[PDB]
Amino acid sequence: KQYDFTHVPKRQGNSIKWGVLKEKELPMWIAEMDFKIAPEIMASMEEKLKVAAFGYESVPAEYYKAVADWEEIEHRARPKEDWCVFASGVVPAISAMVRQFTSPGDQILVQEPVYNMFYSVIEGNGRRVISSDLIYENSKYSVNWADLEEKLATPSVRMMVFCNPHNPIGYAWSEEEVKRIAELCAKHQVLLISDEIHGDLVLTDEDITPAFTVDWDAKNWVVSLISPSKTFNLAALHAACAIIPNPDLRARAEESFFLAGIGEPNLLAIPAAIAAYEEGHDWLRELKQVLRDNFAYAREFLAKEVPEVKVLDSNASYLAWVDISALGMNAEDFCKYLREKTGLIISAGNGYRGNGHEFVRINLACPKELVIDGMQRLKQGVLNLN
Amino acid sequence: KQYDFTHVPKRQGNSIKWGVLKEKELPMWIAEMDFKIAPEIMASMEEKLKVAAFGYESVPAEYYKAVADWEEIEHRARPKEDWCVFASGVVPAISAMVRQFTSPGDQILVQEPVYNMFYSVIEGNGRRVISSDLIYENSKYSVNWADLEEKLATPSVRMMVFCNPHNPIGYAWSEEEVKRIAELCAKHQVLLISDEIHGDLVLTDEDITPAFTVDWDAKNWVVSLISPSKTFNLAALHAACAIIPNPDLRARAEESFFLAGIGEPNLLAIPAAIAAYEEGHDWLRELKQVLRDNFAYAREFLAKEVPEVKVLDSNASYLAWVDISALGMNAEDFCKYLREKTGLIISAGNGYRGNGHEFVRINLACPKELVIDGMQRLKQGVLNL
Ligand SMILES: [Ca+2]
Ligand SMILES: [Ca+2]
Numbered sequence A: 001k002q003y004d005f006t007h008v009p010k011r012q013g014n015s016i017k018w019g020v021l022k023e024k025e026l027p028m029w030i031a032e033m034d035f036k037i038a039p040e041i042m043a044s045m046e047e048k049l050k051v052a053a054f055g056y057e058s059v060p061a062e063y064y065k066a067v068a069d070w071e072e073i074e075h076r077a078r079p080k081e082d083w084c085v086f087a088s089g090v091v092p093a094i095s096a097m098v099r100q101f102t103s104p105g106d107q108i109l110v111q112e113p114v115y116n117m118f119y120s121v122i123e124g125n126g127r128r129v130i131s132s133d134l135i136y137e138n139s140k141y142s143v144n145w146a147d148l149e150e151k152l153a154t155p156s157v158r159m160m161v162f163c164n165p166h167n168p169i170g171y172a173w174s175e176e177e178v179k180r181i182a183e184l185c186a187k188h189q190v191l192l193i194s195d196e197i198h199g200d201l202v203l204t205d206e207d208i209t210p211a212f213t214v215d216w217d218a219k220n221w222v223v224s225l226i227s228p229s230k231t232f233n234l235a236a237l238h239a240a241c242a243i244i245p246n247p248d249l250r251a252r253a254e255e256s257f258f259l260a261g262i263g264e265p266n267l268l269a270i271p272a273a274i275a276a277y278e279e280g281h282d283w284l285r286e287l288k289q290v291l292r293d294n295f296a297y298a299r300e301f302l303a304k305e306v307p308e309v310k311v312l313d314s315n316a317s318y319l320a321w322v323d324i325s326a327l328g329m330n331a332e333d334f335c336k337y338l339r340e341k342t343g344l345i346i347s348a349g350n351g352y353r354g355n356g357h358e359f360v361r362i363n364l365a366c367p368k369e370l371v372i373d374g375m376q377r378l379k380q381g382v383l384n385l386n
Numbered sequence B: 001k002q003y004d005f006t007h008v009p010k011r012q013g014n015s016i017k018w019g020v021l022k023e024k025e026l027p028m029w030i031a032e033m034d035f036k037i038a039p040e041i042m043a044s045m046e047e048k049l050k051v052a053a054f055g056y057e058s059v060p061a062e063y064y065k066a067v068a069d070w071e072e073i074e075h076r077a078r079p080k081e082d083w084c085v086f087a088s089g090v091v092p093a094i095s096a097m098v099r100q101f102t103s104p105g106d107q108i109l110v111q112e113p114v115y116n117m118f119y120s121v122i123e124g125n126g127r128r129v130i131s132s133d134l135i136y137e138n139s140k141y142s143v144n145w146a147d148l149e150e151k152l153a154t155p156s157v158r159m160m161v162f163c164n165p166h167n168p169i170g171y172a173w174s175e176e177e178v179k180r181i182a183e184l185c186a187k188h189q190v191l192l193i194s195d196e197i198h199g200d201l202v203l204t205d206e207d208i209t210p211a212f213t214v215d216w217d218a219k220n221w222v223v224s225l226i227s228p229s230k231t232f233n234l235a236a237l238h239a240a241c242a243i244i245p246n247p248d249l250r251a252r253a254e255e256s257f258f259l260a261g262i263g264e265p266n267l268l269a270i271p272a273a274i275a276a277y278e279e280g281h282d283w284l285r286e287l288k289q290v291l292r293d294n295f296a297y298a299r300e301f302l303a304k305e306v307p308e309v310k311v312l313d314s315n316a317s318y319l320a321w322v323d324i325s326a327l328g329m330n331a332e333d334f335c336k337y338l339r340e341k342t343g344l345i346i347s348a349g350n351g352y353r354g355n356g357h358e359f360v361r362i363n364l365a366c367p368k369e370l371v372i373d374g375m376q377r378l379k380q381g382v383l384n385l
């Protein structure tokens, strides 16, 4: 390989993932990777530090050009650069747009189970979550299209937060799916906020369909949100981008980002994001193969060794979604037991709502040696359930 | 000198201060310095980059300890470490608190002329600015205390955004003034948001009185906002700290920061702020020597060579507030003219409201040679009018 995917980066003491651990505990919960970032990103960060003065920065045209170039090359989906607006994070941009584009008490639609932060930003802002729950049958999730449309058609339903690809299930929607969702939203005058943060991590020979690509009959109703954070192991960089084709919505979102204090870059966001999006292609290619290898190992190991659990077929993300229903234990209980008995720390599905209490989420973006250790621990934990 | 106050940092192309300038142009407008940062802070940033993976960060106890040690050493005012809450920036924290601690339509009190971004975050959020204007007489500003109180006691006036020290005028309020303002707010059930971002830049023997030092029960109505950003030339670091003695108000503020997306540090904020506040004392000491020398030169030069303008007396900040009323030109017009004629770029007072249309603001946090150049350009501008 061209890059290092074998050694775990040594963190400083205030790391969430690696701080405040007990001896020999193995964290596989929170969505950050245990790989070094692309050295091309590191080089840009080092060069920027050498300025040795960190005053106010603008977002340059080159930022948006980088975003468009990356989407073109990786997804054959080139947005117009004028559509693009810097924000310091995806979830903060969602929070700002909740406040700008809905009123207190309004309902915002999601598809449960889904990323727990969506509930926080909706409910924390005094909006109300409504779900069109994903249907779970024969170990796969699907949409109830009539139920989704009925809910979208509700007067008080004003926005849809769409996870594309969908976390935690790891599903990159088909083109026809994304188009149908956009069409339904536009039809019912519902803003479609498409959170595309996992969009570079499709592991099959498929690709995402960014919301911004939909036909002009619906394109004015959509916002696509992307960031290098998940793709490149840069949660703390605080660089993201909203892609908003409608100019009036775009102006208003931009104002909302400035109000929230999320519209101006920190001292690294610009050079580091530009380096990721212009020079990170090769590193990503290699990462995807490391991830495929890890998922293949996990799937084979659990199928053969722990038939009590079922790793869902998923096509995107570095997070495995594992049906633990056959164990007959609430996931929160199971994960607490597992950590106590084995030191393995994985995420309980409960906070994703939907049917999440029957699932655990396992982060596989780590060296193979850590995956092996974790699988062994998970097995021992299930075996010891007596 | 132990540290470098003579070379201007060479910026990348997206710098606001230096970014789009004509050859020859001399920017002395926006409040960032033309000095390299303390090497101790650079060292901490370099060390952090070694991690080469930048996942999620907590705020360590060491961060609050650093803040408290800094305040103790530099201001003789140690906060309890428990009072402290990280935020990604002072203005963004003010914005969050406007939304959490007031309702749409409420009035938020300032003292004009004052930092223009206070108006943006009040009005943008759908609150209404109200001012108790600072009275300008005999080349000095003062407070109209009866007017201030009348406004604070108005039912719809819910918060005061208090600039301590006051930008753009450069005034570090006395202990008695800060205590009085806090009392007035508390008595009238108004939250005092004390923006203390210029507090480490008092250039006289005077020192700031942080709002968190006021006696109980007024103390339960105050929030002190600090940051290494102005002190250390770190605006883009996005590290700040709210100091909030009232535990319930503090928890609510923290919640508001997370809700807005400004509660989580970026991948440099923690080590860099810790370095600044633990190891930055000697650099700051030397900086104040250079700033005093710069101000002394500007005052001497303008008194002798440009009697048509008047630099107001100020005890804090690296920004000079200069009365240009004798020129008989709106400040915005004069600054445009000045830039065209001489290439000097200074801030028109208009945007600070109050009586700012009669003033210009000049940033003196640059090498002495740039100050000498800029003062000469100013002279050239004024005399050629
Ligand atoms: Ca193929
Ligand atoms: Ca076996």
Ligand SMILES: [Cl-]
Pocket: A100, A101, A102
């Ligand atoms: Cl709207």
Ligand SMILES: [Cl-]
Pocket: B100, B101, B102, B191
């Ligand atoms: Cl309140």
